A paper describes a structure:
Eukaryotic ribosome biogenesis is a complex, tightly regulated process that involves many ribosome biogenesis factors and spans different cellular compartments. Here, we answer these questions and reveal how the nascent 60S moves from chromatin to the late-assembly compartment in the nucleolus of Schizosaccharomyces pombe (S. pombe). In vitro, Fkbp39 binds DNA and nucleosomes but dissociates to bind nascent 60S particles and to partition them from chromatin through LLPS. This partitioning provides directionality for the nascent 60S to move into the nucleophosmin-rich GC, where its biogenesis continues.
To understand the molecular basis of the defects in 60S biogenesis caused by the absence of Fkbp39, we tagged endogenous Ytm1 and analyzed whole-cell lysates or isolated (Ytm1 pull-down) nascent 60S fractions from wild-type and fkbp39Δ cells. We analyzed the isolated Ytm1-containing nascent 60S by cryo-EM, which revealed 3 major states in both wild-type and fkbp39Δ cells—each state can be further classified into multiple substates. Among other differences, the RNA domain III is flexible in state 1 but stably incorporated in state 2. Notably, these 3 states look nearly identical in wild-type and mutant cells, but their distribution differed markedly. In wild-type cells, ~20% of particles are in state 1 and 50% in state 2, and in fkbp39Δ cells, the populations are ~65% and 15%, respectively. The accumulation of state 1 particles in fkbp39Δ cells indicates that Fkbp39 is required for a step in 60S biogenesis along the transition from state 1 to state 2. The defects in 60S biogenesis in fkbp39Δ cells occur at multiple steps and indicate an overall delay in the assembly process, in agreement with the reduction in 60S subunits in the mutant. We did not observe misincorporated ribosomal proteins or biogenesis factors among nascent 60S particles in fkbp39Δ cells.
Numbering used by the authors:
A (entry chain D): 387 to 425, 435 to 534
B (entry chain G): 88 to 120, 125 to 173
C (entry chain t): 51 to 249
D (entry chain m): 199 to 247
E (entry chain K): 5 to 29, 41 to 265
F (entry chain o): 102 to 238
RNA sequence: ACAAUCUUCUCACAUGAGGUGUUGAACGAAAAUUUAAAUUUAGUUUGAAAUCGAUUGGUGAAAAGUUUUACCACUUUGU
């Protein structure tokens, strides 16, 4: 039992043990690698503006089901999360660096038509990182 | 009136009250020896303008009769821009 | 003119009183009834617009019909429960011999034929209270401080005192809502200081 | 005397103007007060204050 | 036995869980082990409460109704740093999630929106006994009407052992909020509970109800039914002398 | 001439029918004032209607106390035109509300002196009350 | 004067009794009950949100049968 956070590249080249859940929190930077790398449960987070990946998986002959969640049961710790980030110096610097790196990774995705940074809403992204307003990162 | 009620709960501490607090902590270390971030209202033209551009200000209150009016003439626009 | 906030502020105060009166009466038919004394001094410090009628009558019974009115009361169960009902409006404590003497000697007013008359001479006291063997100011003081047989008659003869707060300092004259910081409740022996600041 | 033409401020800027990172001055007890506290401490033990 | 010189228990409860399992009848991602709770409906010959009493009844029972993984918020008198240290010392961090001083509860949670956010954040609100009467205010219709009533947990002396004991007793016991009503509903368990466990819960709850709720005793009980959210109020036992009992009391 | 009708919303707890009457009477004479209240409890619904003797005075009040920061609540005073001002929105106006204690009157009829005949009219159909449940078994 | 008294624990012998205090609107299940409307009551939504929908049993306190209470509730409106 346990939970591990790793990048796609760090996990790439490593043997995946018997894991109950595999979660794709961020889009895969190498979808051509991911389609064959997926082969207990496989779950992937996708924004409503990146539904073109659903078409790509259908064209690539990938079976899939719909996972839905009740908005009531989602933890409303957004206020507390905002409080911690702005209060801890090291948590904030980690939060800003992660936000900058996530955006720069997003701008470099191969599937420009699917994962388009222009279609991305920066105010929403910073909210997931614990920001009232998006930090000033040059792309 | 309601604005200034909230503003008067965050007045910066007086020059005497600040020295009163500092000498209180000075005595403690003089004998032998951690606090919270101070909350107050932010003032000063350059400081406030820097806060607005930083998108940190929650409520800006501009005086209506600043003598050279161009000191504050851009603030309504800058406040609306940010 | 009267703004909307003052009307709501009164309603919140009235609801505050109604809850207090219910809680003091319901399930709380008790009083700590201070001991080792029989004479108490009751001063009405504060008043609220549109009092509940129960509070209005109790102040009337205790002869505190106007603010800053002060009345001697015989310390017993009956006055204690009335004082508990009107607690937020009256500040009461135990007067001493010195407080009783100067209050009568400097602010004592009698009920002569139903008008407020200063007790400048003992002839009027003898005329109006000769049947109870009361002839002098000092006799009045002894009766009040000892709560004698004619204590009720003496209190009936005496007007309530008017201990309005004194504003001598320039800071006192300028600050608003100045009432000498008159707190409510049973102040014990501190009322001697409050009288001393007055008489 | 044309009306006010807000060609620039009609849209809200979503990010702070500067990109410089926060210094650690703002997350730790102040050094100016600590400097003055040490100065006042010296004054107390020398009998000046 | 105390009911009417007989105990028609067990068989009824063992059956109702069986009918409950008989009426079994996207994929969802947020799951839980929540099951339909078992309700016990009790009819009396008189109104139990002279007025609504906003302090729940600590009906002690060995089969918990609150799952042991339920998050807890502890509401204590000021100061709260003392009590936060005690919770960490007693090792209740995974159980007592947060400790709130009462003044910080009165100030930092003012809006009804803030009250509803705090309500959904925790599963049970343990509150110190000496600050229970204050909680009617500070927590309005958002708590005391939406099925979130603080529990009177007594930690007066402030020690780790009594924290652990009182906390353990808290989840062990079920809770009932007495109001002026001829009939009242008490939670006994869930469908996952076994027949013997639920029967033990019912008899223990009836014992406490007869002792400390119904002043005249078991004779003041009119009828007993056990039910779930959607099932029928299956009767358990009826008063065999109710004719003369009501005649004397009327 | 035309009696104006004004609607006030977001009433702070305390701005009740009395307080509004001595307040709005300063603006101008009031005719029918009614705060809508709940049936079972009688507690305020936090909105009310005022009928001024004129529609001009109602316009001034609406322009005066609309978005009034009162106890943290922005007051909502909007003038209702005559055509959707309906016939009985002032039913019970200026008449104090009755806080009927349904709980206690239920207690009194639960515990009141009563005779054998009405006791028989109580005990009644006990046996078939289980039988309707028995047929569902 | 947008300020005020909603209790940071009691009493009795580790034990019992007590604490009378909750915004409104909307959705909604099926139950115990009492004398068609009334009491409890699962589970949800919400900026202290609002545009007719008021129900009407009983208790008395002051002015003069009458009008005035805007939580007068059965310990029932002024010791």
């Amino acid at each position: 039992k346990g939970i591990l956070l790793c990048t796609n590249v760090a996990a790439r080249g490593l043997d995946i043990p018997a894991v109950d859940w595999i979660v794709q929190y961020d889009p895969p930077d190498d979808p051509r690698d991911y389609i064959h790398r997926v082969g207990g449960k496989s779950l992937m987070f996708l924004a409503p503006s990146e539904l073109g990946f659903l078409r790509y998986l259908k064209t690539a002959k990938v079976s899939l089901n719909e996972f839905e969640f009740p908005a009531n049961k989602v933890a409303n710790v957004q206020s507390q999360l905002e409080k911690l980030v702005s209060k801890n110096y090291y948590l904030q610097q980690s939060a800003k660096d992660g936000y900058r790196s996530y955006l720069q990774a997003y701008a470099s995705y191969s599937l420009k038509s699917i994962f388009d940074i222009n279609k991305l809403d920066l105010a929403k992204v910073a909210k997931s990182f614990g920001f009232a307003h998006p930090p000033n990162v040059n792309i | 009136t309601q604005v200034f009620k909230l503003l008067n709960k965050y007045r910066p501490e007086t020059a005497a009250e600040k020295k009163q607090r500092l000498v209180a902590e000075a005595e403690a270390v003089a004998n032998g020896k951690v606090s919270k971030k101070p909350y107050n209202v932010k003032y000063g033209l350059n400081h406030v303008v820097a806060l607005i551009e930083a998108k940190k200000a929650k409520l800006v209150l501009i005086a209506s009769d600043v003598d050279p009016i161009e000191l504050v003439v851009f603030l309504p626009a800058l406040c609306k821009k940010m | 003119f009267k703004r909307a906030e003052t009307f709501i502020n009164n309603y919140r105060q009235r609801e505050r009183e109604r809850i207090r009166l219910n809680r003091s009466a319901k399930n709380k038919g008790d009083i700590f009834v201070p001991d080792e004394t029989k004479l108490l001094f009751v001063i009405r410090i504060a008043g609220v617009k549109n009092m509940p009628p129960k509070i209005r009558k109790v102040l009337r019974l205790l002869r505190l019909s106007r603010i800053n009115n002060a009345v001697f009361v015989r310390n017993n169960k009956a006055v204690a429960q009335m004082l508990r009902i009107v607690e937020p409006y009256v500040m009461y404590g135990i007067p001493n011999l010195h407080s009783v003497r100067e209050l009568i000697y400097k602010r004592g007013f009698g009920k002569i034929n139903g008008q407020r008359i200063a007790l400048s001479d003992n002839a009027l006291i003898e005329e109006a209270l000769g049947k109870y063997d009361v002839i002098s100011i000092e006799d009045i003081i002894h009766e009040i401080y000892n709560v004698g047989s004619h204590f009720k008659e003496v209190t009936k003869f005496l007007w309530p005192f008017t201990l309005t707060p004194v504003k001598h300092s320039l800071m006192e004259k300028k600050v608003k809502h100045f009432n000498e910081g008159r707190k409510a409740g049973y102040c014990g022996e501190e009322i001697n200081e409050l009288i001393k600041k007055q008489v | 005397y044309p009306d006010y033409d807000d060609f620039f401020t009609n849209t809200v800027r979503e990010t702070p103007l500067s990109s410089a990172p926060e210094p650690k001055r703002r997350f730790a007890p102040s050094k100016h007060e600590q400097k003055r506290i040490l100065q006042l401490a010296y004054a107390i033990r020398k009998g000046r204050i | 036995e105390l009911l009417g010189s007989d105990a028609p228990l067990e068989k009824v409860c063992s059956a109702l869980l069986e009918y409950e399992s008989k009426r079994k009848s996207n994929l969802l991602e947020d799951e839980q082990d929540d099951i339909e709770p078992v309700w016990l409906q009790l009819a009396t010959l008189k109104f139990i409460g002279n007025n609504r009493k906003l302090i729940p009844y600590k009906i002690a029972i060995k089969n918990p109704v609150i799952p042991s993984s339920s998050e807890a918020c502890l509401i204590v008198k000021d100061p709260q740093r003392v009590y936060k240290d005690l919770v960490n010392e007693a090792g209740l961090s995974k159980v007592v999630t947060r400790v709130i001083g009462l003044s910080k509860l009165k100030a930092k949670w003012n809006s009804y929106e803030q009250k509803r956010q705090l309500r959904d954040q925790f599963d049970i609100f343990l509150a110190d006994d000496r600050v229970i009467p204050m909680l009617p205010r500070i927590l309005g219709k958002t708590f005391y009407q939406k099925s979130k009533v603080p529990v009177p947990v007594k930690i007066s002396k402030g020690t780790a052992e009594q924290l652990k004991r009182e906390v353990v007793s808290a989840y062990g016991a079920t809770y009932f909020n007495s109001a002026p009503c001829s009939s009242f509903m008490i939670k006994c368990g869930h469908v996952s509970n076994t027949s013997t466990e639920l029967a033990e819960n019912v008899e223990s709850i009836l014992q406490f109800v007869s002792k400390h709720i119904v002043p005249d005793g078991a004779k003041g009980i009119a009828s007993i039914h056990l039910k779930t959210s959607q099932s029928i109020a299956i009767p358990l036992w009826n008063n065999p002398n109710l004719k003369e009992l009501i005649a004397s009391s009327r | 001439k035309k009696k104006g009708v004004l609607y006030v919303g977001r009433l702070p707890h305390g701005f009740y029918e009395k307080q509004m009457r001595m307040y709005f009477s300063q603006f101008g004479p009031v005719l029918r004032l009614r705060m809508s209240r709940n049936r079972k409890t009688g507690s305020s619904k936090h909105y009310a209607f005022i009928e001024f003797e004129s529609l001009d005075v109602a316009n001034v009040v609406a322009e005066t106390m609309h978005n009034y920061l009162l106890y943290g609540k922005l007051l909502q005073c909007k003038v209702i035109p005559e055509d959707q001002v309906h016939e009985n929105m002032f039913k019970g106006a200026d008449v104090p509300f009755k806080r009927i204690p349904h709980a206690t009157i239920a207690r009194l009829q639960h515990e009141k002196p009563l005779s054998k005949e009405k006791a028989d009219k109580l005990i009644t159909r006990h046996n078939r009350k289980l039988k309707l449940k028995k047929r569902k078994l």
